[PDB]
Design a protein around this ligand. Structure first.
Ligand SMILES: Nc1ncnc2c1ncn2[C@@H]1O[C@H](COP(=O)(O)OP(=O)(O)OP(=O)(O)O)[C@@H](O)[C@H]1O
Ligand SMILES: [Mg+2]
Lengths: 125, 190, 524, 292
C-alpha cells in the first residue's frame, strides 16, 4: 500500500476506491496508511487530510495535528484544527498520554478546557 | 482412530465367502468376536474414517443371521427409548445426525449383502433398485448443504452392486452417469 | 510485470486496460472523487460519515476540494472511482449532498457561494423529485436569511410554497411485494383517495423509462446479492421500517415513489388543514429546528463512588444486598445540585445497575398524608407518580425519530429530552440555548437546571455499554419555585441490579431545607 | 310490528352468542367478501376461553389484525368492565390499531352505546367505553413494545407480532426484547379468567415464540400456507398443525401434497411469484414456518 501510494498518488486514490466496491481488503485500515504516507512525503497538504478522520479507522490523530501545527502560521487555522480533532475524539475512551498532549497544545493556543481538566483528572490513578 | 481391523476382517470374510472356502458358522463366530456390542462413536460423525466399514459389517452380520438391518439396531440407549415413544412432536439433534449420516445407507447395504449371499439375482434386480432409490430418499429429507458426502458414497455402493451381480452392460453404467447430472449428485474424482 | 501474462485471466481485477480508467491529473480531484463515491454507498453509516466529512471541509477555507466535489456532482461521474460491474447509486449521492449543504448553510454558509448555480437547478417545480426540491429550497432560504445573498420577493414567495397543492381548480410482471406496497404506497394514495393499484402504472413507466431498468423482479438480478456481499439479513425490512443496507429493488422503488408523488400535486386535488406535510415529514430528519441529533450528545457523567468501590465485591450477595448509601448518591450528584428526573443504566463485564427517578408537587398539608400513603402498599408497579392535589411538573422524553437515527456519531439519542412544563418556564421567566442544554433564571448567575444524554450505537455481535439521560437542578432554584408555587415536593427512586455473563424509596423535600422519609429526616 | 321486534331481540342475542356471525355482519358492513375457511378456524380457535397461555402462528397477509380488532370490540361488547392491553411493534402500528377500533365502534349501529361519557379520556393511546365506571386503569390501552408498559394491571393481553427485523438484528436488541417479553406476566391480574395471546410469524432462526414454548410452558397452533410438500417436511409437526389440516392430510395424503390451503385468495401462480421475490429459504421461513 505504501509503495503504490508513493509511486503515483492520483492513481492510488482511484484504485483503493474501486477495491472498496469489490470488498478487497475491508478488514484492514488502507485509507489511514495511504493518507499518512502521502502526508509524510510532502505530496498532500495536511489541512486537506485532517477532515478525513470522520471515517472510522486506526488514525494517529496527534501526528496529523502536529503536522498541522508545524506547517501553517495563521492563528485561525490551528484553532480550528484543534476544535475539529477534539470534537471527533471526545466520545470514545483514551489513555492519559493523549489527553495531556491535547492539554499542552490547548495551553499553547490559549484556551482552558476545564472539561479536559476534569476528564484527565478522573483517570489520574 | 482409524483402527483398520474391521475393514481387513470384513475383506477376509468376503473373500472366503466368494471362493466357498469356509462355512457360515465360522463366519458368524469370527464377526461376533470383533463387532462391538454397544454402538461405536463413528456412526454420528460424517468425517470419521471408520463409519462405512461399521455400516457394511453390521449389515453383513444381520443378513448372515437371516434378518435385515434396521435403524434401531445401530441406535444407542437414549435414541432407542426415543424410538419407543409415541406422543412426540420433537426430534433430537443426535437422532437427526444418525438419520442423516448413517440412515440413508441402510437400504443400500441390505441389497448389497443380499446380492453377495446369492439371495437376490440379476433376473429381478431393477425392481429392487427402483424401490431402494425411493426408500433412501424418503429418509433423506433436506440436503440444504452442497457439501454432502452421501452422493459420492451411494455411487460407489451402486457400482459395486452392478459389478457383483454379473453380466453388466453399457446402459447400466450410463444410468449412473445420468443420475450424476442433477444438482447435489456430486461425485468426486477418485 | 509481464511474467504474469500467462496466468492473468479476465475477471482478475477490473479486466484489461482501457483508457476510461485514467485518473484525474491533480490529487485533490481524486480525493473529491473518493468522497463522492462514498456518498453513494449502499450502507447508511458510510453515507453519514461522508456527510460529516463534507461538513468538516466547509468549516475551513478548503476551496479546491469543495469545487471538485461540486464538479463531480454536476457531471455525474461514476466509473474511475467505481467498479465496472456493479450498479452505482447516483441519486443517493445527490440527496446526501443536499442534506450536507442544508446544514452547512445555517451557521456560516459563505463557502457555498461560488457554486450557487447548482441549487437553482433543482429548486423549481418542473423537477418532479420532492425531497431534492425540498432540501434545495431549504438551502437557498437559509442563505437568504443570513444576508449572504438577496432574493426578489416573488421568487421568495415561490420558494416558500414549493410543495403546495396548487392545482386545486383541476403487460409487465414487476410487482411491489408483500411489504413495500401495503406499508409505503398506500399511505401516499390515501392523501388523494387513490388505491395503490391505480398508481402502479405511473411507477412502472418511471422505472422502465427514466431510471432505465428493464429486467424482472427476481432476487438474483442484483449482482451484490448474487455474489453474497449482503450478510445476516441486513437488507430485510417490514412494517414501514427502513433497512440497514439498500438493495437494488428498494433503491428503484424508493426513488420512483418520490417521483410519482410530484405528479399528483400537478394534476389532482387532495382530500382532508394540510395533510401532505404530515406525510412528508415521515421521511425527514428528526428536528424541527433543522439541526442534527449529533449536536445533542454529551459525554458520560462522572461515576458514583459506590459503583467503583463495590466492583470488587462477590457477586451473589451483591445482587441481594443494596445498601442505603446508593440512594444518597442518586438524589445528589454533587453539592448544591439535585436530580429531578432520570433513568439510566451502568454496565461492567459481570454486572449492571438500573436507576429510575421521579418527582412531583403535592399540597403542603396533604403531603404529610401522602408520604405515608405511598409507602404503605402491596406493590409499586400498579401506580404512578404523574407528569405533565398531586400534580405533574416535568414532561418526559419523546418517542418519535427521523432518518438520522443511523448516524454513527449520534449515539442513538432522541432530541426532546425532559424539561419543565410550559407554565414553569413561563412563571419563572427561564431562558436557554439552542439545544436546551442549560437554563438560566432572570435573576441569578448560576444555572437553574442542566440536562444531558449519552450512549452508543450498537454494532452487530457486540456488548452493551452505559447509556441514559438525566435532568438536574440547583437547590436555590427549587426553593424559590416552592416559595412561589406554594407547594411541597415528593420524589421517588428505584435501584435494581442484574447479572451478566429492586429497592425503592421516596423522599419529601420542604422549603425550609429539609428532607423527610417515613423512617427519618435528613438535612444539608 | 312484533315480528321485527322479535327479530331484533333474537339477532342481538345471537351476535353476542356467536363470533362467526359477528364477523359476517362486520365484513358485510365493511363491504368485504365472505371470510375464508382458515379465517373462520382462526377466529373460532381464538374465541375459546380454555386457551390461557396461547400462541397462533400464520403466514403473511392472512388477516391477523382485523381478527384481533373484531375480537376485542366483541369482547367489550359482551362485558364493558374488562381491562385489555394491546402491544405492538411500533408507534405507527399502535395508532393504526386504535384508530381502526374507533372506526369499528362507530360503524355498526348498536356498538354506538359504547361511546364514552363526559370525563372521556378519549385519547388515542388509551380510552374507556361509556358503560365502564370511573376507575384507575383504562378499558383499552394500546402501546408499542418500547413504550410505557408500567402503571396498570391487565386482564387480557394481546401481542401483535412484536418480533421484527427492525428490532431483533443485534444481540443487545434480542436480549432487551427477551427481557420485555419475559416481564409481562407480572402485569396480569391473578383471577382465574385472565388470559394472554400472541399472534405473529417467526423472523429468524431464534424466535421467542419457540422460547416461550420450550421453557415457559405455552401452547401453540400453526397454519402453514400450503399442505406439506414432502414426507420429511410433514414429519416436522404432528401436534402443532391445525386440526382441520391434519384431519384432511391423514386421508388424501397423496393428492393433497403441496396443495394450497386457501385457494380463494392464494392460487399456486400467486405463491410462485413470492418464491421469485425471495429465495427458497425465505419462502420456507415465512410461508411454511419451518426454520432451517
Ligand atoms: N377475505 C378477504 N377478502 C379480501 N380482502 C381481505 C379479506 N380478509 C382481509 N382482507 C384485506 O386484506 C388485508 C389483510 O389484513 P392485514 O393486512 O391486517 O393482515 P395481517 O395478517 O395483519 O398482515 P401481515 O402479516 O402483512 O402483517 C387487509 O387490508 C384486509 O382489508
Ligand atoms: Mg399485519
Amino acid at each position: 500500500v505504501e509503495i503504490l501510494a508513493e509511486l503515483c498518488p492520483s492513481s492510488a486514490l482511484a484504485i483503493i476506491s474501486r477495491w472498496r466496491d469489490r470488498t478487497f481488503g475491508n478488514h484492514r485500515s488502507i485509507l489511514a496508511w495511504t493518507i499518512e504516507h502521502l502526508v509524510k512525503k510532502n505530496k498532500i497538504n495536511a489541512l486537506d487530510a485532517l477532515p478525513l478522520i470522520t471515517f472510522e479507522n486506526d488514525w494517529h490523530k496527534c501526528d496529523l495535528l502536529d503536522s498541522v501545527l508545524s506547517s501553517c502560521t495563521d492563528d485561525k487555522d490551528k484553532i480550528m484544527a484543534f476544535e475539529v480533532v477534539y470534537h471527533y475524539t471526545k466520545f470514545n475512551v483514551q489513555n492519559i498520554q493523549n489527553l495531556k498532549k491535547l492539554d499542552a497544545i490547548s495551553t499553547s493556543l490559549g484556551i482552558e478546557h476545564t472539561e479536559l481538566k476534569e476528564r484527565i483528572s478522573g483517570l489520574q490513578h | 482412530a482409524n483402527n483398520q481391523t474391521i475393514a481387513a476382517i470384513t475383506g477376509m470374510v468376503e473373500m472366503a465367502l466368494i471362493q466357498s472356502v469356509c462355512t457360515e458358522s465360522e463366519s458368524i463366530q469370527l464377526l461376533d468376536r470383533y463387532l462391538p456390542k454397544v454402538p461405536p462413536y463413528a456412526l454420528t460423525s460424517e468425517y470419521s474414517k471408520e463409519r462405512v466399514a461399521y455400516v457394511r459389517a453390521y449389515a453383513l452380520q444381520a443378513n448372515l443371521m437371516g434378518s435385515q438391518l434396521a435403524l434401531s439396531d445401530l441406535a444407542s440407549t437414549e435414541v432407542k427409548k426415543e424410538l419407543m415413544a409415541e406422543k412426540r412432536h420433537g426430534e433430537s439433534d443426535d437422532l437427526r445426525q444418525l438419520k442423516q449420516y448413517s440412515g440413508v445407507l441402510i437400504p443400500w447395504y441390505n441389497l448389497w449383502a443380499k446380492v453377495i449371499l446369492g439371495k437376490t439375482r440379476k433376473a429381478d434386480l431393477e425392481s429392487e433398485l427402483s424401490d431402494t432409490q425411493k426408500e433412501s430418499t424418503a429418509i433423506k429429507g433436506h440436503s440444504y448443504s452442497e457439501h454432502s458426502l452421501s452422493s459420492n458414497e451411494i455411487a460407489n455402493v451402486w457400482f459395486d452392486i452392478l459389478i457383483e451381480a454379473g453380466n453388466v452392460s453399457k446402459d447400466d453404467v450410463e444410468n449412473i452417469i445420468k443420475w450424476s447430472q442433477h444438482k447435489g449428485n456430486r461425485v468426486f474424482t477418485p | 510485470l509481464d511474467l504474469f501474462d500467462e496466468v492473468l485471466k479476465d475477471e482478475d481485477g477490473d479486466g484489461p486496460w482501457n483508457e476510461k480508467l485514467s485518473p484525474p491529473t491533480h490529487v485533490e480531484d481524486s480525493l473529491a472523487g473518493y468522497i463522492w463515491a462514498r456518498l453513494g454507498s449502499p450502507e447508511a453509516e458510510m453515507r453519514w460519515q461522508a456527510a460529516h466529512a463534507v461538513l468538516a471541509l466547509c468549516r475551513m477555507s478548503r476551496t479546491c476540494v469543495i469545487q471538485g466535489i461540486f464538479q463531480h456532482a454536476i457531471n455525474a461521474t461514476t466509473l474511475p472511482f467505481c467498479d465496472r460491474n456493479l450498479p452505482f447509486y447516483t441519486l443517493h449521492a445527490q440527496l446526501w449532498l443536499m442534506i450536507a449543504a442544508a446544514r452547512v448553510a445555517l451557521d456560516d454558509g459563505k463557502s457555498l457561494i461560488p457554486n450557487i448555480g447548482y441549487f437553482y437547478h433543482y429548486a423549481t417545480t418542473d423537477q418532479p423529485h420532492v425531497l431534492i426540491r425540498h432540501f434545495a429550497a431549504r438551502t437557498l432560504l437559509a442563505l437568504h436569511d443570513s444576508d449572504l445573498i438577496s432574493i426578489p420577493a416573488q421568487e421568495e414567495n415561490k420558494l416558500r410554497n414549493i410543495n403546495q397543492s396548487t392545482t386545486l381548480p383541476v403487460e409487465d410482471s414487476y410487482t411491489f411485494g408483500i411489504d413495500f406496497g401495503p406499508y409505503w404506497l398506500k399511505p401516499l394514495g390515501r392523501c388523494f383517495g387513490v388505491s395503490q393499484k391505480q398508481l402502479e402504472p405511473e411507477m412502472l413507466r418511471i422505472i422502465r423509462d427514466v431510471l432505465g431498468f428493464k429486467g424482472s423482479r427476481n432476487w438474483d438480478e442484483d449482482e451484490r446479492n448474487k455474489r453474497r456481499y449482503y450478510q445476516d439479513r441486513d437488507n430485510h425490512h417490514s412494517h414501514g421500517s427502513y433497512p440497514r443496507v439498500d438493495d437494488y429493488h428498494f433503491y428503484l422503488s424508493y426513488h420512483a415513489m418520490f417521483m410519482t408523488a410530484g405528479q399528483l400535486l400537478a394534476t389532482k386535488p387532495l382530500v382532508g388543514e394540510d395533510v401532505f406535510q404530515d406525510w412528508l415529514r415521515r421521511h425527514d430528519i428528526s428536528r424541527n429546528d433543522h439541526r442534527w441529533l449529533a449536536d445533542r450528545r454529551d459525554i458520560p457523567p462522572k461515576e458514583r463512588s459506590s459503583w467503583l468501590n463495590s466492583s470488587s465485591d462477590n457477586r451473589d450477595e451483591w445482587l441481594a444486598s443494596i445498601s442505603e448509601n446508593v440512594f444518597n448518591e442518586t438524589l445528589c450528584p454533587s453539592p448544591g445540585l439535585l436530580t429531578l428526573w432520570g433513568r439510566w443504566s451502568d454496565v461492567c463485564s459481570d454486572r449492571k445497575e438500573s436507576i429510575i427517578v421521579h418527582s412531583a408537587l403535592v399540597s403542603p398539608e396533604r403531603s404529610l398524608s401522602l408520604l405515608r400513603a405511598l409507602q404503605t402498599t402491596k406493590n409499586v408497579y400498579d401506580y404512578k407518580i404523574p407528569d405533565a392535589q398531586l400534580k405533574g411538573w416535568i414532561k418526559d422524553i419523546a418517542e418519535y425519530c427521523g432518518i438520522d437515527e443511523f448516524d454513527p456519531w449520534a449515539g442513538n439519542v432522541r432530541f426532546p429530552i425532559p424539561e419543565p412544563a410550559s407554565f414553569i418556564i413561563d412563571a419563572m421567566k427561564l431562558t436557554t440555548d439552542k439545544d436546551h442544554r442549560v437554563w438560566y433564571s432572570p435573576s441569578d448567575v448560576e444555572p437553574a437546571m442542566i440536562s444531558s444524554i449519552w450512549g452508543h450505537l450498537s454494532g452487530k455481535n457486540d456488548e452493551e455499554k452505559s447509556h441514559g439521560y438525566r435532568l438536574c437542578a440547583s437547590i436555590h432554584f427549587i426553593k424559590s419555585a416552592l416559595e412561589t408555587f406554594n407547594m411541597d415536593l415528593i420524589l421517588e427512586v428505584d435501584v435494581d441490579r442484574y447479572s451478566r455473563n429492586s429497592s425503592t424509596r421516596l423522599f419529601l423535600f420542604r422549603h425550609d431545607g429539609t428532607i423527610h422519609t417515613l423512617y427519618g429526616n435528613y438535612r444539608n | 310490528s312484533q315480528s321485527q321486534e322479535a327479530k331484533n331481540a333474537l339477532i342481538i342475542a345471537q351476535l353476542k352468542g356467536d363470533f362467526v356471525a359477528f364477523l359476517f355482519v362486520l365484513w358485510k358492513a365493511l363491504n368485504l367478501p365472505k371470510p375464508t375457511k382458515c379465517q373462520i378456524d382462526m377466529a373460532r380457535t381464538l374465541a375459546n376461553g380454555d386457551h390461557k397461555k396461547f400462541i397462533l402462528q400464520a403466514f403473511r397477509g392472512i388477516g391477523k389484525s382485523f381478527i384481533t380488532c373484531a375480537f376485542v370490540v366483541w369482547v367489550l361488547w359482551r362485558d364493558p368492565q374488562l381491562k385489555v392491553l394491546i402491544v405492538s411493534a411500533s408507534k405507527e402500528r399502535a395508532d393504526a390499531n386504535s384508530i381502526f377500533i374507533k372506526n369499528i365502534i362507530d360503524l355498526l349501529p348498536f356498538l354506538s352505546e359504547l361511546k364514552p361519557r363526559p370525563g372521556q379520556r378519549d385519547s388515542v393511546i388509551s380510552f374507556d367505553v361509556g358503560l365502564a365506571k370511573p376507575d384507575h386503569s383504562p378499558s383499552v390501552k394500546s402501546v408499542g413494545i418500547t413504550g410505557q408498559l408500567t402503571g396498570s394491571r391487565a386482564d387480557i393481553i394481546i401481542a401483535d407480532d412484536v418480533e421484527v427485523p427492525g428490532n431483533s438484528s443485534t444481540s443487545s436488541a434480542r436480549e432487551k426484547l427477551w427481557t420485555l417479553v419475559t416481564e409481562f406476566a407480572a402485569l396480569l391480574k391473578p383471577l382465574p379468567t385472565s388470559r394472554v395471546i400472541y399472534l405473529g410469524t417467526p423472523q429468524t432462526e431464534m424466535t421467542l415464540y419457540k422460547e416461550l414454548e420450550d421453557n415457559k410452558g405455552y401452547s401453540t397452533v400453526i397454519w402453514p400456507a400450503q399442505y406439506p410438500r414432502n414426507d420429511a417436511e410433514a414429519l416436522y409437526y404432528g401436534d402443532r398443525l391445525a386440526p382441520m389440516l391434519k384431519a384432511e392430510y391423514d386421508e388424501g395424503f397423496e393428492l393433497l401434497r403441496g396443495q394450497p390451503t386457501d385457494p380463494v385468495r392464494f392460487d399456486m401462480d400467486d405463491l410462485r411469484e413470492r418464491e421469485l421475490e425471495y429465495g427458497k429459504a425465505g419462502y420456507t421461513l415465512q410461508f411454511m414456518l419451518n426454520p432451517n
